């Protein structure tokens, strides 16, 4: 429930990694700051989920770093809780009801997701997400579908808009995502 926020200096390698990724598609924005969110209990629950996923998915690289735009007022909620059940920015559209994450930052930089606040600042997290093994989503999902109807325990881990060339992923569970970095920027 408790956490720390550490601002990255522009000259730190970590700053540059995050900024470079963001700027692949968001170079016309101006980055005001980049912070690392340190929430030990959330990190520990996320690592336990990764350890379980890594034990079951074979060679799959279960983790992706993806983007999530949100309004200024959701930042304290995400910082304490991650993208949990009460997170007001969960969405229910063509790929299911859950939390939506973008492969590319420009998608999250849309004003609909990273709403500019009264000072014009926009907020996009760069999030460790356990994408695991995924399939094509659909509007009815609140959890991902089962992989094999002949042994329906094991579900897909996430769903996506396009299995072989994804642009977004939907995660349905708490502790499937860790809000590692917060990028504050403007137009």
Ligand X SMILES: NC(=O)c1cccc(NC(=O)/C=C\C(=O)O)c1
Footprint of ligand X on this chain (CB under 6 A)?
Answer: 67-69, 91, 93-94, 100-102, 107-108, 113, 168
Taking the complex as a whole, the smallest distance from the CB of residue 70 to ligand X amounts, in Å, to: 6
Which residue sits closest to ligand X, CB atoms considered? Answer: 108
By C-beta, is 54 or 116 nearer to ligand X?
116
The residue with tokens 């325990």 is: 153
CB-side neighbour CA atoms (13 Å) of 43: 10
Is the distance from CB of 186 to CB of 32 less than 8 angstroms?
yes
Q: Where are the alpha helices (DSSP H) in the chain?
A: 13-26, 40-56, 75-81, 105-108
Half-sphere exposure of 112 (CA within 13 A, CB side): 5
86 versus 151: smaller Cβ distance to ligand X: 86
Q: Which is nearer to ligand X, 115 or 147 (CB)?
A: 115
Nearest Cα residue to 166 out of 84, 99, 98, 95: 95
- Cα-based distances in Å from 79 to 5, 44, 106, 148, 177: 9, 14, 22, 36, 12
From the CB of 39, what's the least distance to ligand X, in Å?
20
Residue 42 vs 159, nearer CB to ligand X: 159
CA-CA distance, 22 to 16, in Å (whole number)? 10
Give the nearest distance from C-beta 169 to ligand X in angstroms. 8
- The minimum distance between CB 127 and ligand X, in angstroms, equals 9
Closest contact distance (angstroms) between CB of 56 and ligand X is 26
Q: In terms of CB distance, is 50 or 122 closer to ligand X?
A: 122
């Amino acid at each position: 429930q408790n956490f720390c926020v550490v601002e990255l200096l522009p000259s730190d390698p970590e700053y540059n990694t995050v900024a470079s990724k963001f700027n692949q598609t968001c170079s016309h924005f101006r980055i005001e700051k980049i912070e690392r969110i340190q929430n030990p209990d959330l990190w520990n629950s996320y690592q336990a989920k990764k350890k379980t996923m890594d034990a079951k998915n074979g060679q799959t690289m279960n983790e992706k770093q993806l983007f999530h735009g949100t309004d200024a007022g959701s930042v304290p909620h995400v910082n304490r809780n991650g993208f949990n059940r009460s997170y007001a920015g969960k969405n229910a559209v063509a790929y299911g009801k859950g939390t939506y994450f973008a492969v590319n930052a420009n998608y999250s930089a849309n004003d609909t997701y990273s709403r500019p606040d009264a000072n014009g600042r926009k907020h996009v997290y760069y999030v460790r997400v356990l994408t695991g093994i995924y399939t094509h989503g659909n509007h009815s999902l609140i959890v991902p579908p089962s992989k094999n109807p002949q042994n329906p325990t094991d579900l897909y881990d996430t769903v996506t808009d396009n299995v072989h060339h994804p642009s977004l992923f939907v995660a349905f569970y708490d502790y499937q995502a860790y809000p590692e970095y917060l990028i504050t920027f403007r137009k």
